[PDB]
Amino acid sequence: GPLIVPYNLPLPGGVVPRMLITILGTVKPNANRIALDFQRGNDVAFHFNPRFNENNRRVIVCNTKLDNNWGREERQSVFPFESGKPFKIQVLVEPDHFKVAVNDAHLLQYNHRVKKLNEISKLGISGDIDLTSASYTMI
Ligand SMILES: OC[C@H]1O[C@@H]([Se][Se][C@@H]2O[C@H](CO)[C@H](O)[C@H](O)[C@H]2O)[C@H](O)[C@@H](O)[C@H]1O
Ligand SMILES: [Cl-]
Ligand SMILES: [Mg+2]
């Protein structure tokens, strides 16, 4: 039941521990990239960036953008997306980190570099996907 990409999901009052964000969709055939951008105004608190061709390898890049400057990248070779295939990304907000799971398997955690979780009020979803659903609940 598509939404059009790029898609902005409002996070009113920011994020809080025990908040679970669920993204359903399908990777396009011959995808180059996916990006989730958790934004505090112009800053990017948490950038989650699967790259399907970085020097002919698949890698997940996580980072934070402060005052338009990217910080130190945390990379992950474990790559559970496939071109043409449906996925579920779950982002669980915990007190000290974002926890990410894809297709019900734990993938990575990302320690909070931005401390004002209550100001992370937008999630940008972009890249080579068909978007079915983006929602949140409290667990
Ligand atoms: O992936 C596609 C793009 O990637 C950036 Se990589 Se530089 C920078 O890195 C940040 C993470 O530290 C963010 O992922 C930015 O979006 C990216 O532009 C490079 O300029 C090119 O390869 C371009 O084609
Ligand atoms: Cl902060
Ligand atoms: Mg295939």
Residue numbers in the entry: 112 to 250
Q: Which statements did the authors publish about this structure?
A:
The sugar binding site is further divided into subsites A-E, whereby subsite C is the canonical β-galactoside binding site, while subsite D interacts with the second, neighboring sugar ring of the natural ligands.
Crystal structures of hGal-3 CRD with SeDG and DSeDG revealed that in both cases a galactose ring (here termed “inner” galactose ring) could bind within the carbohydrate binding site at subsite-C. A very strong peak within the CRD was revealed in the calculated anomalous difference map for the selenium atom in each of the SeDG and DSeDG structures. In contrast, the distal galactose ring of DSeDG and its Se–Se linkage show evidence of adopting two conformations. One has ~30% occupancy for the distal galactose ring and has its Se–Se linkage orientated toward subsite-D, and the other (~70% occupancy) is oriented towards solvent. The electron density for DSeDG could not be unambiguously traced, however, based on the weak density associated with the distal galactose ring in the 70% occupancy conformation there is an indication that C6′-OH could have the ability to make a hydrogen bonding with water molecule W4. This offers an explanation for the lower affinity of the DSeDG compared to SeDG. The elongation of the distance between the two Gal-units in the DSeDG is not compatible with forming an ordered structure for the second galactose moiety, explaining its low-level bioactivity.
